[model samples]
Target: MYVRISGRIRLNAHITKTKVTVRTENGWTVVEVPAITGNMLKHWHFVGFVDYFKTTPYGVNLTERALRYNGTRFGQGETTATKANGATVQLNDEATIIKELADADVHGFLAPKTGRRRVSLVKASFILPTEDFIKEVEFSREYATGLYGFSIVLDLGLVGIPQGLPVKFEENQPRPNIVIDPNERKARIESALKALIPMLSGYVFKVEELVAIASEGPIPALVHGFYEDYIEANRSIIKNARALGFNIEVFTYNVDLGEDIEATKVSSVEELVANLVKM
Candidate 1:
């Protein structure tokens, strides 16, 4: 069902793995994006960016496995393909593996990767409710500061967005080899990871974008039960990432009987009384 899933995905992803890295160098880790990316979404998991990973027939780093698992459904079968260098290569034993590999996004391959490379990036924020009617009501809070992570708001039920979107094949050559010097390779990897910030930054949906999607295809039914189902079921993709400490979340709102529904903020019952009395 299609409801106006509005909220913020404030990524408070920090370098929390080891003490040394946390203290000295907050760097980006080579991690894979989720497999089950939903369709074209404005804001997913409450964030503007949705990252996913994939493999290549060409020079993808062997040490960096495209997917630790779930990239393909394993079954024995011989699949053959030709590479850019005009040489034939044998793919995985499973045909399903072949399809998924082709389908995967061309980028880093570690599953659930993390770390805060730069300070601002670590505490970087992603906004939601970027729609017209939702703007005043949701924009202020969704776009507000101080939100930590997914525990607050997130959505994982839209579409699988390629880590490097639009599938830029020629542009997206294989990532630098992990075998390269740690310093050099780390810098290269860092560049790649850091680049995602700008790429992700602009990936939001204004009112028109959401309206376009709805126009092309009906945005499901925004009934109360439909919204409840979304709230319950939408957190599936980021479940593991959250457990692993990535601050991700999907955002949805409570539905009322088709009217102006606002979650007013009040510090105390007296505060509410004062406001009502003033009114």
Candidate 2:
């Protein structure tokens, strides 16, 4: 499964920023614009996942590195931990790594010495200002409210499955064998998606509008950072995707795309979470 989330959001603080020189009628000048980098959002999701994972049955006995959200996941040397029986367990193999840490399995890690790497299943775009904010740059607005947009993609199929393993084909996408238990896989996926609540700034900033595309293969809709009419904009792309024999479902929150749009309208963030948690 694959999931794509895109929409406009209202933020109260300057969580992230970057320096950029802009073209003006008189001359070019540098300014600090309010922005959120993909790196920041990606890390935030990882943090959220770790927090949520600890509350579940699968969270017990996680590696110390996994609990700390360490990027050097396996480190450069031997990775070992103590078992309940006081026996040392080496976590060098892909299967052991995945079984031991859900964060490594979901977000991925790299072993520089052995050249072992698991590509991250999640991808995030920098949350940038729309045309309205871009047209008029402001410095003091960083402390005030600002409207921004971004996109997040989650490769659900990769969860609980080791990378570099053989895969079978399904509608032009590789379907891998799941090594983890079915129930465990479900919990991991749900925990990762639940991380989105905080990623969206649920408790702090406000999400003006959001559209999520869930499909069996790649996202069938045009991923938009900002939208004039959120649902209508992706209409043609969804139409094309359905024509191609792909299974796709559209979910929206706080946006009225109309009765003919063919999307389920979620009333609140909690409801939206429930809808996407489904496989």
Candidate 3:
């Protein structure tokens, strides 16, 4: 079985073409795409990690793959077009999609312990607003669980940062300087999380089974462990809420290369959830 996961975040303003850039392990690079609308300037990042199982009748199978985004740009691109009415218009691609399969670096290890084996092909794609003028960020996670006979799909969405919320960062960096205070970040995260709790409870039909006890506001520490602690503490609230019949998940913002002015994870859904889950 092959599982794929992907999602995107739309922005409130048109993304600037020249301000786009992508960051990889090597360094920053450029991605080409079309211009996007003012309503599409948010940043979104996604990753698909393949997991396999040996005991199933299919022998080798993908057990899980997840996609995430934080509203901040890790990779950036833009698009331009000419209208038939003799007008030239430019906008961010908003949905800059990237799909790769069988790439050594992307899907290199399939059932690593049992050696390399090709059973099935899995392809995943994500689309989001340009990074240059992002204001709001949202993220979702989906997973396929099972080998062949019986399978299950698990899906979840997270809200990272709200609009008009100021973000802080270190001073004197190449990118824009927006340092979000630790206290402010925590307050904003808790506010968003609290709002989501009721909305999710109303939809799950399991509201009675979930309950929100006490929640710790966001911590300002930059260390991964500190973020993890915040996530874990919140997870307790989610666990308790689940007992009331609602499924609640927490997400945190991570670093973004384009926002190089600061040393923080790109503030997208994926980075936030990954930090919380410690994945």
Candidate 4:
């Protein structure tokens, strides 16, 4: 199963800055905009996964660095491999590492020394204010409040599966076999999905999820137009997606899409998570 999500979020005082070009009467102008990078979103998902997985039976399999959500991973005086000459070599066992640490498996890591790597199954787009929501700037240590758009893509099918490894070292590497059990893989996928609730619920002020569309399978799904009610705006796109064979389930809190759109309505983030888990 592959998962793709797009949503409009209302956040207050959550500030991450990046340089962006804004249109001006004279010409395009560069400005420091309050933004959230995809990297930050990816990191939070990893943190959530680690936090949630710890309570599961397979939590004990996490490497110490993984338990800390440390990016340095096996390079930080943890584990390494021994060469044929009995010399210390950087960890090259991608399969074992992925099986041992679900975070490394999903979020990806680099060994730094030997260039051993696993491509992250999860990808995120920078959370930027929609054009309609972008106003001008201000102040030292600026904070932003706006309706931002975000998308997260998860290749759930790749969970617990190693990549870029082969029976022999070929110029073009082939996909490696899955090294973890089915139960562990399922737990990894569930934990990864569950991570989303805490991720968007709130960091400080509760993020108002104005609208969202969560879809399963390859096609990317998003709501169109802007509506506080979060329904009519997205109906057309979802209907098209369904026509094209997308398995989708909509989740919302305190919002209605009416009979024209079918969705699971909830009252809080807790219910949202519950609904997602049940799905």
* Candidates' RMSD to native: 21.0, 4.7, 23.5, 6.0
Candidate 3 accuracy as TM-score:
0.18
List pairs with backbone clashes in candidate 4: none
Weakest 10 consecutive residues, lDDT, candidate 1?
207-216
Q: Which TM-score value belongs to model 2?
A: 0.80
Give each model's clash number. Answer: 20, 0, 45, 0
- Model 2 clash pairs? none
Ranking by TM-score: 2, 4, 1, 3
Candidate 3: residue 205 Cα off by (Å): 1.4
lDDT agreement with native, every candidate: 0.24, 0.70, 0.23, 0.64
Query: Could you say which candidate leads in TM-score?
Result: 2
Model 2 per-residue lDDT tens digits across residues 1-279: 678888887776435566433222234444345556787778878878878887888775355655666655666765665432344556666677677667778887776655667878878877766544555653545425777777888887788788777465768987665778888888888888888877776543688888788867775645565444445666667767767777788888877656465788887667777788876
Worst lDDT window (10 residues) for model 4? 223-232
- For all predicted structures, in order, the TM-scores are 0.22, 0.80, 0.18, 0.74
Worst 10 residues of 2 by lDDT: 20-29
lDDT of 4 by residue, 135-176 (tens): 434232323665666667777777877777434334676445
What order do candidates take by lDDT, descending? 2, 4, 1, 3
Over 148-168, each residue of candidate 1 has an lDDT whose tens digit, in order, gives 111111111111223223132
